[PDB]
Write a protein that binds this ligand. Structure first.
Ligand SMILES: [Eu+3]
Ligand SMILES: [Eu+3]
Length: 196
């Protein structure tokens, strides 16, 4: 048996516009569209994905970068398919003017630096924002925050989450999964920030 708290909740599924980009210049220009829609201090949900196979002692190289900039739009930048890392995206990620929210984001910063020599700037660990605004001291996960704040759980098909993110093109399922994780980061920040 199990408590109500242990019940399976509805899955969180982003239903807004998912912009898929797999070319460097397209990506850079898209990053500028993002910059035109935001103002200093604004926060976007952040996440990234990498293939399952290990490479020379480390995790597969980052293949996808996701940015949810509003409740109705999320970008999927398939960098593994790009000839060069998009300059517009590098500057957006290194821009202190835009805040990037997520869980375990400090670890993303490290991997991003190792993989592309990019310095993620002005990121916020959602775990700390939650403990701060919810007035608690918990060890959160993106899933537990989605559950606590939204009453939903994250899609969990392991064959999708641990799929070959570097395989082009991404499947509709991969796109849904990746976009939704960044969307979660965006919504969680927004809902927490509004708290008095
Ligand atoms: Eu992640
Ligand atoms: Eu993810």
């Amino acid at each position: 048996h199990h408590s109500v708290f242990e019940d399976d909740l509805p899955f969180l599924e982003f239903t807004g516009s998912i912009v898929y980009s797999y070319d460097a210049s397209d990506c850079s220009f898209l990053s500028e569209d993002i910059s035109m829609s935001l103002s200093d201090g604004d926060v976007v949900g952040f996440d990234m994905e990498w293939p399952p196979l290990y490479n020379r002692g480390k995790l597969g190289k980052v293949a996808l970068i996701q940015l949810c900039v509003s409740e109705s739009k999320c970008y999927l930048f398939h960098v593994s398919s790009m000839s060069v890392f998009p300059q517009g995206l590098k500057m957006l990620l290194e821009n202190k003017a835009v805040k990037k929210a997520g869980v375990g984001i400090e670890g993303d910063q490290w991997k991003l630096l190792r993989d592309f020599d990019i310095k993620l700037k002005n990121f916020v660990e959602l775990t700390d924002v939650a403990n701060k605004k919810l007035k608690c001291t918990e060890t959160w996960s993106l899933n537990s925050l989605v559950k606590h704040l939204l009453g939903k759980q994250l899609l969990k098909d392991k064959s999708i989450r641990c799929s070959n993110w570097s395989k082009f093109p991404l499947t509709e399922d991969q796109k849904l999964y990746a976009a939704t994780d960044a969307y979660a980061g965006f919504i969680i920040y927004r809902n927490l920030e509004i708290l008095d």
